[PDB]
Amino acid sequence: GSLPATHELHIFGSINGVDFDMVGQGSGNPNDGYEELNLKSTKGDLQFSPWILVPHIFHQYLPYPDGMSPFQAAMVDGSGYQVHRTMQFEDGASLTVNYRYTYEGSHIKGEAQVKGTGFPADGPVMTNSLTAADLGWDSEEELSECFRIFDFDGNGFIDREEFGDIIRLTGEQLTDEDVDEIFGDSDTDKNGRIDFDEFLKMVENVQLTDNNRSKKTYPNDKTIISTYKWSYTTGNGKRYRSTAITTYTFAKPMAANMYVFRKTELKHSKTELNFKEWQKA
Ligand SMILES: [Ca+2]
Ligand SMILES: [Ca+2]
Protein backbone atom coordinates (compact mmCIF):
# COMPACT_ATOMS: atom_id res chain seq x y z
CA GLY A 1 0.00 0.00 0.00
CA SER A 2 3.06 2.23 0.23
CA LEU A 3 5.36 4.03 -2.13
CA PRO A 4 9.02 3.21 -1.47
CA ALA A 5 11.45 4.93 0.84
CA THR A 6 14.28 2.37 0.99
CA HIS A 7 15.63 -0.47 -1.08
CA GLU A 8 18.29 -3.12 -1.30
CA LEU A 9 19.80 -4.89 -4.27
CA HIS A 10 21.56 -8.18 -4.91
CA ILE A 11 22.97 -7.98 -8.45
CA PHE A 12 24.99 -10.91 -9.71
CA GLY A 13 25.80 -12.99 -12.73
CA SER A 14 28.64 -13.01 -15.22
CA ILE A 15 30.40 -10.70 -17.66
CA ASN A 16 32.39 -12.44 -20.41
CA GLY A 17 32.00 -15.68 -18.47
CA VAL A 18 33.47 -14.40 -15.17
CA ASP A 19 31.09 -14.40 -12.20
CA PHE A 20 30.45 -11.35 -10.05
CA ASP A 21 28.16 -10.64 -7.11
CA MET A 22 27.34 -7.36 -5.40
CA VAL A 23 25.06 -6.43 -2.53
CA GLY A 24 23.95 -3.27 -0.84
CA GLN A 25 21.30 -0.88 0.33
CA GLY A 26 19.92 2.49 -0.66
CA SER A 27 16.98 4.84 -0.50
CA GLY A 28 15.09 7.34 -2.60
CA ASN A 29 12.21 9.77 -2.93
CA PRO A 30 9.28 8.55 -5.06
CA ASN A 31 7.75 12.02 -5.32
CA ASP A 32 10.87 13.47 -6.95
CA GLY A 33 12.57 10.50 -8.63
CA TYR A 34 15.75 10.58 -6.55
CA GLU A 35 17.66 7.39 -5.80
CA GLU A 36 20.92 6.51 -4.07
CA LEU A 37 22.50 3.08 -3.70
CA ASN A 38 25.69 1.54 -2.34
CA LEU A 39 26.95 -1.81 -3.65
CA LYS A 40 29.87 -3.98 -2.51
CA SER A 41 31.43 -6.90 -4.30
CA THR A 42 31.34 -10.21 -2.44
CA LYS A 43 33.75 -11.97 -4.85
CA GLY A 44 36.81 -9.74 -4.95
CA ASP A 45 37.69 -7.02 -7.39
CA LEU A 46 35.30 -6.30 -10.21
CA GLN A 47 36.81 -7.19 -13.58
CA PHE A 48 34.69 -4.86 -15.72
CA SER A 49 33.41 -1.29 -15.66
CA PRO A 50 30.47 -0.96 -13.25
CA TRP A 51 29.17 1.78 -15.52
CA ILE A 52 27.60 -1.01 -17.58
CA LEU A 53 25.34 -1.62 -14.55
CA VAL A 54 23.92 1.88 -15.19
CA PRO A 55 21.09 2.61 -15.72
CA HIS A 56 20.02 -0.89 -14.60
CA ILE A 57 20.75 -0.31 -10.90
CA PHE A 58 13.79 0.64 -9.23
CA HIS A 59 11.09 2.52 -11.15
CA GLN A 60 8.96 2.40 -8.01
CA TYR A 61 10.86 5.60 -7.17
CA LEU A 62 10.37 7.24 -10.58
CA PRO A 63 7.07 9.14 -11.02
CA TYR A 64 5.37 10.41 -14.12
CA PRO A 65 4.86 14.15 -14.65
CA ASP A 66 1.21 13.92 -13.61
CA GLY A 67 1.41 11.36 -10.79
CA MET A 68 2.39 7.75 -10.16
CA SER A 69 4.06 5.76 -12.89
CA PRO A 70 2.54 2.33 -13.58
CA PHE A 71 5.52 0.82 -11.75
CA GLN A 72 4.64 2.79 -8.63
CA ALA A 73 0.97 1.84 -9.00
CA ALA A 74 1.88 -1.85 -9.13
CA MET A 75 3.88 -1.56 -5.92
CA VAL A 76 1.11 0.36 -4.14
CA ASP A 77 -1.50 -2.24 -5.05
CA GLY A 78 0.87 -5.13 -4.22
CA SER A 79 0.52 -6.91 -7.56
CA GLY A 80 3.98 -5.97 -8.83
CA TYR A 81 5.92 -6.67 -11.98
CA GLN A 82 9.12 -8.25 -13.28
CA VAL A 83 11.67 -6.76 -15.68
CA HIS A 84 13.79 -8.08 -18.54
CA ARG A 85 16.37 -5.41 -19.42
CA THR A 86 18.60 -5.75 -22.45
CA MET A 87 21.36 -3.57 -23.85
CA GLN A 88 22.94 -4.09 -27.27
CA PHE A 89 26.31 -2.41 -27.80
CA GLU A 90 27.96 -0.99 -30.91
CA ASP A 91 30.75 -3.63 -30.78
CA GLY A 92 28.35 -6.60 -30.78
CA ALA A 93 28.31 -7.10 -27.03
CA SER A 94 25.07 -7.73 -25.18
CA LEU A 95 23.85 -7.43 -21.61
CA THR A 96 20.73 -8.90 -20.02
CA VAL A 97 19.55 -7.87 -16.55
CA ASN A 98 16.51 -9.69 -15.12
CA TYR A 99 14.83 -8.17 -12.07
CA ARG A 100 12.46 -9.48 -9.45
CA TYR A 101 11.23 -7.54 -6.43
CA THR A 102 9.52 -8.16 -3.12
CA TYR A 103 8.02 -5.48 -0.92
CA GLU A 104 7.85 -5.00 2.85
CA GLY A 105 5.95 -1.78 3.47
CA SER A 106 7.97 1.06 1.97
CA HIS A 107 11.01 -1.19 1.50
CA ILE A 108 11.92 -2.84 -1.81
CA LYS A 109 14.08 -5.95 -1.96
CA GLY A 110 15.43 -6.30 -5.49
CA GLU A 111 17.44 -8.98 -7.19
CA ALA A 112 19.00 -8.59 -10.62
CA GLN A 113 20.53 -11.52 -12.50
CA VAL A 114 23.00 -10.39 -15.16
CA LYS A 115 24.58 -11.93 -18.23
CA GLY A 116 26.96 -9.92 -20.38
CA THR A 117 28.83 -11.37 -23.33
CA GLY A 118 30.85 -10.32 -26.32
CA PHE A 119 32.69 -7.39 -24.79
CA PRO A 120 36.11 -6.97 -26.46
CA ALA A 121 38.77 -8.00 -23.98
CA ASP A 122 40.67 -4.74 -24.57
CA GLY A 123 37.65 -2.44 -24.82
CA PRO A 124 36.54 0.16 -22.28
CA VAL A 125 34.11 -2.12 -20.47
CA MET A 126 36.52 -4.94 -19.77
CA THR A 127 39.35 -2.52 -18.88
CA ASN A 128 37.26 -0.18 -16.71
CA SER A 129 37.79 3.00 -18.74
CA LEU A 130 34.23 4.27 -19.04
CA THR A 131 33.59 7.49 -17.11
CA ALA A 132 29.89 8.37 -17.54
CA ALA A 133 26.54 7.17 -18.86
CA ASP A 134 23.84 9.24 -20.54
CA LEU A 135 20.58 8.87 -22.42
CA GLY A 136 20.83 9.31 -26.18
CA TRP A 137 23.53 9.07 -28.84
CA ASP A 138 24.41 12.76 -29.14
CA SER A 139 27.98 13.85 -28.61
CA GLU A 140 29.42 17.35 -28.70
CA GLU A 141 31.41 16.35 -31.79
CA GLU A 142 28.29 15.22 -33.66
CA LEU A 143 26.43 18.37 -32.61
CA SER A 144 29.39 20.46 -33.81
CA GLU A 145 28.93 19.02 -37.30
CA CYS A 146 25.25 19.98 -37.22
CA PHE A 147 26.08 23.51 -36.05
CA ARG A 148 28.55 23.99 -38.88
CA ILE A 149 26.04 22.91 -41.56
CA PHE A 150 23.63 25.65 -40.61
CA ASP A 151 26.11 28.43 -39.89
CA PHE A 152 25.69 29.66 -43.46
CA ASP A 153 27.81 32.82 -43.28
CA GLY A 154 30.47 30.81 -41.43
CA ASN A 155 30.89 33.32 -38.59
CA GLY A 156 30.80 30.78 -35.73
CA PHE A 157 27.32 31.76 -34.54
CA ILE A 158 23.76 30.96 -35.54
CA ASP A 159 21.87 34.17 -36.23
CA ARG A 160 18.09 34.51 -36.38
CA GLU A 161 18.07 33.98 -40.15
CA GLU A 162 20.13 30.80 -39.92
CA PHE A 163 18.07 29.48 -37.00
CA GLY A 164 14.96 28.78 -39.07
CA ASP A 165 16.49 25.84 -40.93
CA ILE A 166 17.80 24.42 -37.64
CA ILE A 167 14.58 24.53 -35.65
CA ARG A 168 12.77 22.86 -38.58
CA LEU A 169 14.47 19.64 -37.45
CA THR A 170 11.90 19.12 -34.69
CA GLY A 171 9.31 18.46 -37.41
CA GLU A 172 6.85 20.74 -35.61
CA GLN A 173 4.84 23.45 -37.36
CA LEU A 174 6.01 26.69 -35.78
CA THR A 175 5.02 30.27 -36.51
CA ASP A 176 7.61 32.98 -37.05
CA GLU A 177 6.95 34.15 -33.47
CA ASP A 178 7.21 30.64 -32.00
CA VAL A 179 10.69 30.58 -33.55
CA ASP A 180 11.44 34.08 -32.23
CA GLU A 181 10.64 32.93 -28.70
CA ILE A 182 12.85 29.84 -28.93
CA PHE A 183 15.66 31.92 -30.43
CA GLY A 184 15.48 34.49 -27.64
CA ASP A 185 15.40 31.82 -24.95
CA SER A 186 18.40 30.09 -26.55
CA ASP A 187 20.47 33.29 -26.73
CA THR A 188 21.17 33.30 -23.02
CA ASP A 189 23.76 36.12 -23.10
CA LYS A 190 21.52 38.36 -25.25
CA ASN A 191 24.05 39.19 -27.95
CA GLY A 192 21.63 38.26 -30.73
CA ARG A 193 23.47 35.12 -31.83
CA ILE A 194 23.55 31.48 -30.71
CA ASP A 195 27.09 30.30 -29.96
CA PHE A 196 27.98 26.63 -29.79
CA ASP A 197 27.53 26.38 -26.00
CA GLU A 198 24.09 27.99 -26.32
CA PHE A 199 23.34 25.64 -29.22
CA LEU A 200 24.10 22.58 -27.08
CA LYS A 201 21.65 23.78 -24.44
CA MET A 202 19.02 24.62 -27.07
CA VAL A 203 19.30 21.09 -28.49
CA GLU A 204 18.39 19.65 -25.10
CA ASN A 205 15.70 22.20 -24.33
CA VAL A 206 13.82 21.75 -27.62
CA GLN A 207 14.82 18.12 -28.16
CA LEU A 208 16.10 19.00 -31.61
CA THR A 209 17.73 15.57 -31.87
CA ASP A 210 15.26 13.68 -29.65
CA ASN A 211 18.26 12.79 -27.48
CA ASN A 212 16.06 12.23 -24.42
CA ARG A 213 13.25 10.40 -26.19
CA SER A 214 12.20 7.19 -24.47
CA LYS A 215 9.61 5.25 -26.44
CA LYS A 216 7.02 3.08 -24.76
CA THR A 217 4.84 0.53 -26.46
CA TYR A 218 2.19 -1.69 -24.91
CA PRO A 219 2.03 -5.02 -26.74
CA ASN A 220 -0.63 -6.28 -24.34
CA ASP A 221 -2.34 -5.00 -21.22
CA LYS A 222 0.31 -6.50 -18.93
CA THR A 223 3.44 -5.39 -20.83
CA ILE A 224 5.41 -2.20 -21.27
CA ILE A 225 8.38 -2.10 -23.61
CA SER A 226 10.64 0.90 -23.12
CA THR A 227 13.27 1.48 -25.77
CA TYR A 228 15.85 4.19 -26.19
CA LYS A 229 19.34 5.04 -27.32
CA TRP A 230 22.05 5.14 -24.68
CA SER A 231 25.74 5.98 -24.48
CA TYR A 232 28.77 5.78 -22.27
CA THR A 233 31.72 8.16 -22.20
CA THR A 234 35.12 6.59 -22.74
CA GLY A 235 38.62 7.55 -21.76
CA ASN A 236 39.36 9.44 -24.95
CA GLY A 237 36.05 11.35 -24.66
CA LYS A 238 34.38 9.45 -27.52
CA ARG A 239 31.01 7.80 -27.06
CA TYR A 240 30.36 4.09 -26.72
CA ARG A 241 26.81 3.67 -27.92
CA SER A 242 24.12 1.11 -27.19
CA THR A 243 20.42 0.42 -27.60
CA ALA A 244 18.21 -0.38 -24.60
CA ILE A 245 15.07 -2.53 -24.64
CA THR A 246 13.35 -3.03 -21.30
CA THR A 247 10.32 -5.30 -21.08
CA TYR A 248 8.09 -5.02 -17.99
CA THR A 249 5.64 -7.84 -17.26
CA PHE A 250 2.92 -6.88 -14.80
CA ALA A 251 0.97 -9.40 -12.76
CA LYS A 252 -2.25 -7.42 -13.30
CA PRO A 253 -3.36 -5.27 -16.23
CA MET A 254 -2.15 -1.70 -15.94
CA ALA A 255 -4.84 0.86 -15.22
CA ALA A 256 -6.52 2.08 -18.39
CA ASN A 257 -4.97 5.53 -17.98
CA MET A 258 7.73 11.07 -23.93
CA TYR A 259 11.13 12.15 -22.73
CA VAL A 260 13.32 11.26 -19.77
CA PHE A 261 15.57 13.78 -18.01
CA ARG A 262 17.65 11.96 -15.44
CA LYS A 263 21.23 12.33 -14.33
CA THR A 264 23.38 9.54 -12.89
CA GLU A 265 26.54 9.58 -10.85
CA LEU A 266 28.74 6.59 -10.07
CA LYS A 267 31.78 6.65 -7.80
CA HIS A 268 33.51 3.28 -7.84
CA SER A 269 36.53 1.40 -6.61
CA LYS A 270 37.21 -2.21 -7.58
CA THR A 271 35.07 -3.40 -4.68
CA GLU A 272 32.48 -0.73 -3.88
CA LEU A 273 30.28 1.72 -5.70
CA ASN A 274 28.05 4.63 -4.74
CA PHE A 275 25.32 5.46 -7.23
CA LYS A 276 22.99 8.44 -7.36
CA GLU A 277 20.19 9.29 -9.78
CA TRP A 278 18.24 12.53 -10.10
CA GLN A 279 15.10 13.16 -12.14
CA LYS A 280 14.53 16.68 -13.44
CA ALA A 281 11.66 18.42 -11.64
CA1 LIG B 1 26.35 32.54 -38.79
CA1 LIG C 1 24.38 34.47 -27.52
Residue numbers in the entry: 11 to 67, 70 to 269, 276 to 299
From the reporting publication:
GreenT-ECs combine large fluorescence changes upon calcium binding and binding affinities (Kds) ranging from 0.8 mM to 2.9 mM, making them tuned to calcium concentrations in extracellular organismal fluids. The sensors were constructed by inserting a small fragment of a calcium-binding protein (68 amino acids) into a fluorescent protein. Compared to the GCaMP design, prominent in high-affinity biosensors, our design yielded sensors with fewer calcium binding sites per indicator (2 vs 4) and conserved original N-and C-termini of mNeonGreen for the fusion of subcellular targeting motifs.
To elucidate more details on sensor function and for guidance for our protein engineering efforts, we solved a high-resolution crystal structure of an early variant of the sensor in the calcium-bound state to 1.3 A° resolution. It revealed a structure in which the ß-barrel of mNeonGreen is opened to harbor the minimal calcium-binding domain of TnC. Using structure-guided optimization and extended iterative directed evolution we were able to dramatically enhance fluorescence changes and response behavior of the sensors.
